[PDB]
């Protein structure tokens, strides 16, 4: 009756925290490092691309960017690192960054004339707002979403427009104020020399001066826009007064918030597929607890951890010594090569309470999609990348920590306990067989193959095989 | 590079509808407008309107308006012109021209239409 | 808004400069930046832009052709002459919707 266990011809080697490279029979592997690069729609939802342009040059309607003014609904936004029109008039977007990420929990929005161009300013002028920069088709344009408001025949009349949010949701107001670079251009487009502009809401106050300066050449113009936001609560009123330099707005955005949507820049291809969780390098279908991707998740995903290697050892290591005769299950005894079922049945369900426990114990990454920073928030964006990285140490050293604790654990259990099965078959009958020395004690009393039923049930009597041994 | 491609010279009868072709090669058709001008003779060339091929805008002149109907195929890379009711006077050599901001470039091959 | 080139028809001799003018009813300058081109046409052929944006000389052009002026007054001046460029000139603007072309003016060695 010699005791072992299965082995099995797997090429499969994992580490434990003693020593690393050890093969073992079955193991599982925890760390998803696959992906098909197509960016799959999440939850049956397409994404929004923004192909070739990024928030702004889709939020102001640049004109580049046309085919993304019919979008109403989205998954997540997709932003290509080749994604350069916005602002096609050179300025600066106050609070880009905050746009985007209030952009990123919008789960979508319906894009309607807040002010109709034909009956909103019927004494300014409307129509020759073009400039060369924001060119289109071989011909001067501007931006689908703005209205960059001039003089009406020699007179830039004080405009009080005003607008009341109805439509019951969060409205995205957008706006401009122009800068023209020398006063005799501030007095042909506005009459006024000391013109402004006041947006104010019930939330909102903010007042606005042109500044005009001589400036460097920007994508051929020396003035500058600054492009301004702000959210409007349901049932509250804007109101914008303006004497001269505003890009009134044309097209609002009313926001329907959602949860788990998130602004990604990724470098795929649309294609039609359904998936839970989307990295920028691709989509993921897995249920393994940890992936090593991308850190950057859409929907429900692995955790991410920067190691390359997560194995369990859900089998036995394999090379007493290895006997491949019984293969029932993991455990069992050589009777003349019969695996057992009760030892083996308990250790495999111990050993999947132990790996499903480590799943269950690491939460799913919701969208850990990351944020954007401006050249005066180095110190923001250091903190930030900071929390980042401290978090990704702390949880690749948890997985690999607890790994290595399982590892070694397992394999402690499954060569303890050949040696309970061992112990107890020895227990059934004592002094009526001879241990050899190799695990395997024999009788001194020959048996047919069917005495060996009385072991294997573990029903024995002495006395009954009690004979002399010299 | 770019060329454009239009009809032969042609002569129709006075009081019926003309139809110009006007073929874009090396480029994305829908990319650019195209504008159509006519050089009447001992005249300078007068804008006669301008369509964009994917959108299908057509922006007319409102003296040549109705008197002009610009219409395009994507599908096979020309945009066309419709005059009705031709005249001597209407008579001319017409132009189309892929334009830039501060003019048209690339102009066309020109096509009269004498009546 | 209307163009007007001056001198309607004007005569040069070879090397010495030809200075054509172009007046506008309203100013084609928006935001700085100008709109007026400079067109040339040899007969039975299309006409072919010299200047864009009033002073912007074109890729692949001789150095002799010149643009300068703004708001209403423009001018273009080419020097020296040469034989070929005997043909009719056209400014353009490119400021209000019709955009209309120029009268057009003759340059005869």
């Known amino acids: 009756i010699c005791i072992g266990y299965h082995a099995n011809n797997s090429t499969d080697t994992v580490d434990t925290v003693l020593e690393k490279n050890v093969t073992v029979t079955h193991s599982v592997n925890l760390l998803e490092d696959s992906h098909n690069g197509k960016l799959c729609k999440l939850k049956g939802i397409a994404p929004l691309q923004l192909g070739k342009c990024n928030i702004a040059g889709w939020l102001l309607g640049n004109p580049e960017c046309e085919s993304l003014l019919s979008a109403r609904s989205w998954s997540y936004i997709v932003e290509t690192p080749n994604s350069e029109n916005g602002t096609c008039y050179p300025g600066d977007f106050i609070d880009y960054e905050e746009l985007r990420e209030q952009l990123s929990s919008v789960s979508s929005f319906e894009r309607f004339e807040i002010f109709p161009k034909e009956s909103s300013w019927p004494n300014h002028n409307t129509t020759k707002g073009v400039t060369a920069a924001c060119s289109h088709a071989g011909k001067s344009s501007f931006y689908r979403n703005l209205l960059w408001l001039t003089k009406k025949g020699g007179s830039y009349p004080k405009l009080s427009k005003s607008y009341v949010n109805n439509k019951g949701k969060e409205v995205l107001v957008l706006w401009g104020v122009h800068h023209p670079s020398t006063s005799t251009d501030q007095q042909s487009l506005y009459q006024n020399e000391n013109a402004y502009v006041s947006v104010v809401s019930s939330n909102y106050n903010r007042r606005f001066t042109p500044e005009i300066a001589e400036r460097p050449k920007v994508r051929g113009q020396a003035g500058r826009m600054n492009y301004y936001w702000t959210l409007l609560e349901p049932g509250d009123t804007i109101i914008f007064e303006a004497t001269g330099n505003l890009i009134a707005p044309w097209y609002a955005f009313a926001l329907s918030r959602g949860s788990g949507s998130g602004i990604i820049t990724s470098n795929a291809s649309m294609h039609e597929c359904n998936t839970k969780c989307q990295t920028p390098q691709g989509a993921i279908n897995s249920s393994l607890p940890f992936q090593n991707i991308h850190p950057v998740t859409i929907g429900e995903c692995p955790k991410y951890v920067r190691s390359t290697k997560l194995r369990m050892v859900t089998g036995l290591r394999n090379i007493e010594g290895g006997w491949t005769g019984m293969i029932d299950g993991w455990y069992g005894y050589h009777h003349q090569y019969a695996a057992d079922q009760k030892s083996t049945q308990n250790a495999i369900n111990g050993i999947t309470n132990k790996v499903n426990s480590v799943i269950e114990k690491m939460n799913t990454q919701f969208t850990a999609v990351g944020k954007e920073f401006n050249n005066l928030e180095k110190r923001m964006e250091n903190l930030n990348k900071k929390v980042d990285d401290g978090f990704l140490d702390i949880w690749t050293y948890n997985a690999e920590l607890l790994v290595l604790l399982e590892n070694e654990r397992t394999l402690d259990f499954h060569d303890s306990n050949v040696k309970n099965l061992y112990e107890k078959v020895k227990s059934q009958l004592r002094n009526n067989a001879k241990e050899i020395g190799n695990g395997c004690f024999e009788f001194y009393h020959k048996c047919d193959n069917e005495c060996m039923e009385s072991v294997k049930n573990g029903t024995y009597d002495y006395p009954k095989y009690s004979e002399e041994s010299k | 590079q770019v060329q454009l491609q239009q009809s032969g010279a042609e002569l129709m009868k006075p009081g019926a509808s003309v139809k110009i072709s006007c073929k874009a090669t090396?480029?994305?058709?829908?990319?650019?407008?195209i504008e159509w001008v006519k050089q009447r003779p001992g005249h300078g060339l007068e804008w006669i309107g301008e369509?964009?091929?994917?959108?299908?805008?057509?922006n007319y002149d409102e003296r040549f308006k109705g008197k002009a109907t610009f219409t395009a195929d994507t599908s096979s890379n020309t945009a066309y012109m419709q005059l009705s009711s031709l005249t001597s006077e209407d008579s001319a050599v017409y132009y189309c021209?892929?334009?830039?901001?501060?003019?048209?470039?690339?102009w066309g091959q020109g096509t009269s239409v004498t009546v | 808004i209307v163009l007007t080139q001056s001198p309607a028809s004007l005569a040069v001799s070879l090397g010495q400069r030809a200075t054509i003018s172009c007046k506008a009813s309203?100013?084609?300058?928006?935001?700085?930046?100008?709109?007026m081109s400079w067109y040339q046409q040899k007969p039975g052929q299309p006409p072919k832009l010299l200047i864009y944006a009033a002073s912007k000389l074109e890729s692949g052009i001789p150095a002799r052709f010149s643009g300068s002026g703004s708001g209403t007054d423009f001018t273009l001046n080419i020097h020296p002459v040469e034989e070929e460029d005997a043909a009719t000139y056209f400014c353009?603007?490119?400021?209000?919707?019709?955009?209309?072309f120029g009268g057009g003016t003759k340059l005869e060695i």
């Open positions: 309203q100013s084609v300058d928006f935001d700085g930046d100008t709109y």
């Open positions: 369509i964009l091929p994917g959108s299908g805008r057509t």
């Open positions: 353009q603007q490119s400021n209000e919707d019709p955009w209309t």
């Open positions: 021209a892929r334009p830039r901001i501060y003019g048209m470039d690339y």
């Open positions: 090396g480029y994305t058709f829908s990319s650019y407008w």
